[PDB]
Design a protein around this ligand. Structure first.
Ligand SMILES: [Mg+2]
Lengths: 258, 227
RNA sequence: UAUUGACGACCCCGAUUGGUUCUACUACAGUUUC
């Protein structure tokens, strides 16, 4: 799963939260203007765009302080073993040897298909039933591939530079990020292809927060969380973040505007 | 319009039991084992016109699933919850073999695991990192269904919701027929005889009384002799 | 005028987006010889 994909789902939920709070509609904007909203411009970053905003000429672009890694499966296959899957031609024929190979059950298809399972789908015509002419398709569903933990790296130094040093200003950005992670753990952020079509819903078992050199008022972040609702973060800390967050909701200024 | 496979109401006890037995030639409580391909000469008709299934999900098994919904208006949400809260003995039809009676399912809500809020409720939820209480939507559930029912009454102008033609028809699909006649493909013999000459009901119909397929809401059965 | 007489499977992917926007050179050394 590319980090591009995991970043993009996180960004989308972060924006929906911000726009929801402000009740700011997204429908009349083109895509480059849809992306450009508060706090996410600092966390996820913004396109370079020069503007003569005030006779002064300024760049709106800044890099994302939040970076995401590609997430790979624990399962692995030799390069030719997968080339046997890409080049199978009979779902009940030569595909079955290839998946038995790649899933690591070369003699046991009923275990092989607990890892990668071919699915067939039809579109069913609404007057006749049966199936719509041409509308038959199939999916190799990785029903049982196990995945390694997702790594998100938040550059606190880069945000703090955007806010011209003021660590008070981190709390709305940190508050947003924790709200995004709360939804991820509550199955509110599906990932990958076909999310509305039988794929993409993840269970989160544990979020580990491990910062280095955090400022002392953010030091409570260093935690391993297993409650989806963040209840493993200190209530005084969650209540502090809620306060700085609510104070920003009451006036959602461009927080890096000095 | 939209084709639907009415629920096979009133199939007798044991109809799905012991399914390898070729009961198709005998009317147990008046139903032939209509889902089974008859044996011919006492051997199984594994012809290339049909499939065979090694097993099936037993009746009364149970599944849970969740529906996650975004920005549904009270009319669009009202329609959905009506389908999930149809009165008793309404059943949805799922999966394959529906003409043969397979795949009838009962849907109902688990209200103790449902959490619907309007966007103003989510402004509160995303307002704080502390736990903040959800609305008890079960007070509203009846309001939403009526928003749907009145919109259908209003647009498809009718003196009742249940008198709207696609509503009345859809009800009989979900509920099945009540006249206790069997559901099977048209055939000119009561038994499913092993050769399966269903076409000759249509030729008897064609030379004879030329019945059209009755209206779904009328619950009118075809005669076995359409002549 | 209305007879003749029983067989048989089908669909195999379809539609679409295929790059969009910003930066396009900026500082200089322009003659040197204690
Ligand atoms: Mg296909």
């Amino acid at each position: 799963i590319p980090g591009s994909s995991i970043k993009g789902i996180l960004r989308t939920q972060a924006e929906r939260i911000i726009r929801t709070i402000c009740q700011s509609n997204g429908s009349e904007k083109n895509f480059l203007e849809q992306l450009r909203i508060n706090l996410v411009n600092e966390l996820f970053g913004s396109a370079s765009l020069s503007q003569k905003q005030n006779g002064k000429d300024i760049d709106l672009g800044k890099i994302g302080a939040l970076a995401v890694n590609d997430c790979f499966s624990s399962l692995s296959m030799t390069p030719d073993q997968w080339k046997a899957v890409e080049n199978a031609t009979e779902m009940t024929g030569n595909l079955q040897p290839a998946l038995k190979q790649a899933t690591g059950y070369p003699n046991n298809i009923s275990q092989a298909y607990k890892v990668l399972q071919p699915a067939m789908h039809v579109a069913v015509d609404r007057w006749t039933g049966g199936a719509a002419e041409g509308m038959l398709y199939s999916v190799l569903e990785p029903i049982g591939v196990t995945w390694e933990p997702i790594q998100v790296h938040l550059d606190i130094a880069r945000l703090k530079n955007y806010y011209h040093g003021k660590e008070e200003k981190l709390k709305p950005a940190i508050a947003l990020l924790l709200l995004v992670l709360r939804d991820l753990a509550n199955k509110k952020i599906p990932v990958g292809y076909g999310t509305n079509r039988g794929m993409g819903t993840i269970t989160v078992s544990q979020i580990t927060l491990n910062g280095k050199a955090l400022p002392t008022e953010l030091e409570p972040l260093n935690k391993t969380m297993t409650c989806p609702n963040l209840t493993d973060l200190d209530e005084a800390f969650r209540q502090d973040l809620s306060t700085a967050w609510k104070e920003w909701i009451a006036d959602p200024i461009d927080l890096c505007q000095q | 319009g939209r084709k639907v496979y009415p629920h096979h109401k009133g199939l007798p006890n044991g109809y799905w039991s012991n399914p390898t037995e070729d009961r198709s030639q005998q009317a147990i409580q008046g139903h032939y084992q209509e889902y089974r391909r008859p044996k011919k000469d006492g051997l199984e008709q594994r012809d290339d016109q049909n499939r065979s299934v090694k097993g099936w999900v037993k009746p009364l098994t149970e599944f849970t699933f969740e529906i996650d919904v975004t920005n549904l208006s009270e009319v669009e949400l009202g329609a959905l919850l009506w389908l999930l809260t149809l009165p008793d003995l309404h059943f949805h039809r799922l999966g394959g073999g529906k003409p043969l009676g397979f795949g009838s399912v009962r849907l109902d809500i688990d209200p103790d695991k449902t959490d619907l809020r309007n966007g103003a409720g989510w402004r509160d939820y995303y307002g704080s990192l502390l736990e903040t209480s959800q609305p008890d939507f079960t007070t509203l559930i009846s309001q939403w269904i009526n928003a749907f029912q009145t919109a259908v009454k209003e647009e498809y102008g009718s003196s009742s919701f249940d008198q709207v033609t696609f509503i009345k028809a859809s009800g009989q699909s979900l509920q099945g027929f009540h006249d206790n006649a069997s559901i099977h493909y048209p055939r000119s013999t009561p038994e499913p005889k092993p050769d399966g000459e269903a076409f000759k009901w249509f030729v008897a119909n064609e030379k004879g009384r030329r019945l059209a397929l009755p209206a779904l809401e009328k619950s009118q059965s075809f005669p076995i002799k359409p002549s």
